[PDB]
Every structure is written in C-alpha cells, then in structure tokens.
C-alpha cells in the first residue's frame, strides 16, 4: 500500500479502419501543483505498439524500464527479432496485465491505468486497457480516468459499434482525438495544453507526433459574464 | 438453517432444512446440508456453506485413508476429532462451522459428536445447530424419550425442522431425513415444506396461528 504522489491524467484512444490512435498530455501534477511540464506518457515499443500510461509517474517510469528491458530480452538468441518473432501488442499487453494483477494480489500495486495500442502481424487493430487492479477490457474507444467521462462520449459518436470501424478514416479519427483533447483541457483541472499523439497504421506504420497544442479555443463568451 | 440429530432406542435420526441465504436473499431452496461420508457416517452443515462442504468432503477423504491404512472402519470419535483438530488450527482466521458428526460402529454404538469452528467438540444424545436451533429444540425436547419407535422418531425429526422452517426466516425449503442404524444410514426422502406444512396442519390439527 502506498499513495500516488506525482501523477499523469487522461490517456485517450480509438480504432479506425487501418489502425489505432492514442494520445496523452505532457503534464506531471504534484497534487494541485502543476509541477512538471515536459513529461512523455506515450512510450513506443518497437514499430507496432504504443503504451499510454496514466497515474503515478514513478511507477510509470518503472513500467518504462520493464518494457525497454522486454525489448532487450526478446532480441536475445532471436534471429527473427526484427521480423516474425518481433514483440506484438498482444504480447506486451498480456505481460503488463500479468504484472499489474500480480502486484495488486501482493497488496503493493503499480498505481496506474494503462492503454496498449497497436497493430498485429495480420493487420488487426489492437486496443486494450489495464489498471492497478488487473482489470482489463477492450472497446472501439478507450480512455483512462477523466477521459472516460468526457472523451469517450465524443469518440463514441464517431465509432459507436464494431461495424463503424471500417467506415472511419485516419483523418476523421485524428480530428476526433485532437477535438477530445481540447474538451479535456477546458474541463480537467489537472491537464495541460501540450500533448503527444501516436498513430499506428497497418500501411504507414508508427507515426509519433510531439509538441502538439490545443487550439481554436472559445473564450469570447467570458466577457459577457457579470457576477453570479 | 436448522440441523438436528438425536439418539434413540432404534439408532440415530438426522434431519435438516434445505435453504441457503445471502442476508435476506433466498439463494436456494434445494440445498444439501447432509454429507454422506461413508455408509456409517453422516455430517451436518451449519454456518458457512463453503467451509462446511469443503472441510466435511475433505473429512471423508481422511476417513477413507484411515480404513485403507488400518483395514478397519474409522470410529465416530476419531472422525469427529480429525475435523475438530483441523478447525482448531484455523482458529481466529474466521471459519464459520457448526456441524454434527453422526454414525454407528460396533465399538461405540450409535454416536453423535457436535463440532464447531471455535474448537468445541462434544459428545451427546441431542443436538440442534443453526439459526433455527431454538425452534427445533422446543419441539424436540418436549416430545422426546428413549422409548420412541422408528416411525415416531422419523416424524419428530421431520416435525422439528418444520417448526423451525416456519418461525425462522433463514430456514425452510424442504426437509431431508436420514435414519442411522447398526446396518448403516438410510435416506427417508425430501419433503417440501410447501406441501408438508398444510398436510401436517390438516392431519395434526396444529399451527392455529395460521390462516388456512
């Protein structure tokens, strides 16, 4: 048993026709204090998987080292480490899910919520969630913490069920994700303007975008507010 | 839950209700609260459903290993003490167990041992265990004697569960009857309280607190 000290807020994600998108802001909060403004919470594993992490940042950094160490270990005695025997999203997730549930079962959890986004060998989209309790689930859209309440409603209007995934292009999906990140910046007190986004496509591969910003911000209506 | 077992002229009667509860939620009315350990040994289940079912099933395995090792039927005294010494090891961990180990051997004759999760182990002629034990004791004590026939003893055990099934909210469903003699145990049916109550009311002229 501990308590989380330095923290990261929402990680959001969705599927689209050819792959998956995942995003998270670059803030490390220290309670109400917006302490660290340059924290990367999307951590790529190979060229087919991105693991987005929220919650305790010290525990995130521990998980980052476990993944880095997983890549090293897979390469050992593996001539097909960059081909047929490369790490899959499903392998990386199952490992983390095993760890998370083991740690909760020893009453010493890793204080995080994690989304593993990627594309598999056969072109299938992979998107799955795991948290500090070892609870796992998949859905066309996934979001952690605050994003579950505000991002999912918006993202589900683009992909409401499985059959909407082939109908959704990468442009429509990325717009929705960037739009959701704006809404979260208005309304989440422990969020920031600066964020990272990662697309994993079956054709174009892994695109990792840094130093994005929320823009097109509606504040004009604020001048007309007089008292309560 | 209401479980009873008593000793008389022609052996041992064992009777139990069949209701399982999770608070006020009636989870089942077709539950087995008697465990058949061997042709000469029965175990009753009160308290925690899992704790009783598990450790009394395990008891049957330990009784089997005794008769393989020793080429002889385990005594009721020894069988009951395996269970009592087991629960005593788990004492303070929160096991919930109120049980009766009933059986016959040539050595000791018909014998009943009460065993519970806080370590108590008692030999005796009459026992009632469960949330409805008091209701069963009331009918059983006031109509009991060694004299009793096998027909009357089976009925009294049936009737004593019915009494508790009526008054106790957590007892009911049906009555499972067992008769234990020198030759072994004999099952004497599953009697639904739904029908049994009205039949006993009509034929006996009792339960006048009831509209019907």
């Amino acid at each position: 048993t501990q308590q989380p000290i330095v923290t990261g807020t929402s990680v959001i994600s969705m599927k689209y026709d050819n792959g998956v998108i995942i995003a998270a802001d670059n803030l490390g909060s220290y309670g109400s204090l917006l302490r660290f403004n340059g924290v990367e919470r999307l951590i790529p594993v190979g060229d087919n998987t991105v693991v987005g992490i929220s919650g305790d940042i010290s525990d995130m950094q521990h998980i980052e080292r476990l993944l880095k160490d997983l890549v090293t270990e897979n390469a050992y005695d593996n001539p097909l480490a960059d081909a047929e025997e490369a790490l899959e999203p499903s392998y990386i997730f199952e490992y983390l899910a095993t760890v998370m549930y083991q740690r909760r079962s020893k009453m010493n959890p890793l204080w995080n919520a994690i989304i593993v986004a990627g594309v598999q060998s056969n072109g299938d989209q992979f998107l799955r969630y795991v948290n500090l309790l070892g609870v796992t689930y998949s859905s066309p859209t996934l979001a952690t913490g605050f994003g579950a309440h505000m991002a999912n409603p918006l993202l589900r209007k683009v992909v409401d069920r499985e059959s909407d995934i082939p109908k959704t292009t990468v442009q429509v999906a990325e717009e929705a994700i960037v739009n959701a990140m704006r809404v979260l910046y208005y309304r989440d007190a422990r969020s920031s303007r600066n964020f990272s986004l990662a697309i994993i496509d079956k054709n174009t591969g892994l695109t990792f975008k840094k130093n994005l910003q929320v823009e097109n911000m509606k504040w004009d209506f604020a001048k007309d507010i007089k008292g309560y | 839950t209401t479980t009873l077992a008593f000793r008389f002229q022609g052996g041992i009667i064992v009777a139990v209700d069949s209701r399982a509860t999770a608070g006020n939620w009636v989870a089942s009315q077709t539950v087995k609260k008697v465990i058949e350990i061997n042709p000469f040994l029965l175990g009753t289940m009160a308290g925690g459903a899992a704790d009783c079912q598990f450790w009394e099933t395990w008891l049957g395995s330990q009784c089997r290993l005794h008769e393989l090792r020793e080429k002889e039927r385990i005594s009721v005294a020894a069988a009951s003490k395996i269970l009592s010494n087991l629960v005593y090891q788990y004492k303070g961990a929160g096991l919930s167990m109120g049980t009766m180990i009933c059986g016959y051997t040539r050595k000791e004759g018909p014998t009943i041992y009460y065993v519970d999760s806080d370590g108590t182990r008692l030999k005796g002629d009459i026992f009632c265990v469960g949330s409805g034990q008091t209701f069963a004791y009331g009918v059983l004590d006031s109509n009991y004697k060694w004299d009793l026939s096998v027909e009357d003893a089976l009925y009294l055990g049936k009737r004593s569960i019915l009494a508790a099934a009526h008054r106790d909210a957590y007892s009911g469903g049906s009555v499972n009857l067992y008769h234990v003699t020198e030759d072994g145990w004999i099952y004497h049916g599953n009697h639904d309280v739904g029908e049994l109550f009205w039949k006993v009311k009509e034929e006996e002229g009792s339960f006048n607190n009831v509209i019907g």
Binding site: H149, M150, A151, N152, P153, L154, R156, N179, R182, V183, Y186, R187, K218, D220, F221, D224, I225, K226, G227, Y228 | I211, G212
Partner: protein, 219 residues
C-alpha cells in the same frame, strides 16, 4: 440524471432525461424532470428527487403570491435568490441541484443552483451524474446566439450523450423552449430507445393461482 440548458438568440432551451432510479434499479422510465416555476421560468432538477420537487414547488408558490401582489411577471433573479438563500440556510442538507432557465423583462437568463447555495450565471450548464457527458457535447459544439432549431438539437444531443454514456441517466429526452413570444414544453422531444419487444406471453390463465377465501363489497 442528465439535465442541461443553453442561452440561444431568442431565449432559453432546457433539457432533461426521464430516468428515475432507486439505487441501481430504475423505478420510472418516463419521469418528468423539468419543473414549472412561473409561466416564463422553468427549472430542471437533479440530486435528491424529493428535495428537487419540494424546493421548486415552494418557490413556485411563493413567486405566484409575489406576482399577484406586484401584478407583473416574476424575474429569474428572484427565483434564483429565493432558491439560493433557502438552500444556503440548510447548509447542503436539502440536496437540490437545479438548472434554472427563463425569460424576463430584462431578457433570457440561465442559472445553475447547487445544494449548498452557490449559483453560477452562464450561457450553458449541465448537472447530474451525466453532466460530464453532456458538457463534452457543449464544449464541442456550443456557440453564442444560436437559432432555435440548432439550440434544440444541441441540447437534445447533450442529453443523449448522458443517456447513452451515463448509467444513472436514460429513457426519453424532454425539452423546454422559452422565448418572449412562446413557451414550448416538448415531452417527449425524442424517443432514442424503442421499448424492448418480448418474444413470449408469460401471463397465467384464469384459475391458476390458489385462493383460500374471497369477499365482495359494492360501493
């Protein structure tokens, strides 16, 4: 519960879902949550349901007496004050969470009132368990000075977000459009879910139940 309101060009559009719950159980699927305060002022209600009904009824009664005495239509600011001051005095124990909307001599006004007696005066608000789902829709698509049918659609869309994504909310969508020239009380505005069709007829035939005694008395 998902309740919401917006200030549009000509006036106010209020919105609400229709699910009433008893813990995890739905007690009423088509329950009305938009309450009458005065002819030009209505009030959506969330939180403790009895507190919401009794607080809006009391302030509606007192405003009726106020309006009979003064001989003029009541204002939203007085509805706001009377609700506010009462709720403050009871220090949060009256669990009424209201979206108050109406149209005065001074134009359209929209308030959110909280149980402890704080109010915010805003161009759009959402309350209840589905407020975050609904607020996401408003932050996505709201702009000032919308036309009527557009504002209707935005509120409806915001309530829908609550219905589908929040488990506490459900059922139909009720709207209330308030302007200087009219009041449109739309119940239901939309039926987003059809009632589930049952495949079998489980109703028992006559004589099936076992009766003891019978008594007939005429009136």
């Amino acid at each position: 519960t998902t309740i919401a309101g917006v200030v549009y060009k000509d006036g106010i559009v209020l919105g609400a879902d229709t699910r009433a719950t008893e813990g995890m159980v739905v007690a009423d699927k088509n329950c009305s949550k938009i309450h009458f305060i005065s002819p030009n002022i209505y009030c959506c209600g969330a939180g403790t349901a009895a507190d919401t009904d009794m607080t809006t009824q009391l302030i509606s009664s007192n405003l009726e007496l106020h309006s009979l005495s003064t001989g003029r239509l009541p204002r939203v600011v007085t509805a706001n004050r009377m609700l506010k001051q009462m709720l403050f005095r009871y220090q949060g124990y009256i669990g009424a969470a209201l979206v108050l909307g109406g149209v005065d001599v001074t134009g359209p006004h929209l308030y959110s009132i909280y149980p402890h007696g704080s109010t915010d005066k805003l161009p759009y608000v959402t309350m209840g368990s589905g407020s975050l789902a609904a607020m996401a829709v408003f932050e996505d698509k709201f702009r000032p000075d919308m036309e009527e049918e557009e504002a209707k659609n935005l509120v409806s869309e915001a309530i829908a977000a609550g219905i589908f994504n929040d488990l506490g909310s459900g059922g139909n969508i009720d709207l209330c459009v308030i302007s200087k020239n009219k009041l449109d009380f739309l119940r239901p505005y939309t039926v987003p879910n059809k009632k589930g069709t049952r495949l079998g007829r489980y109703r028992c035939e006559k004589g099936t139940t076992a009766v003891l005694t019978e008594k007939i008395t005429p009136l």
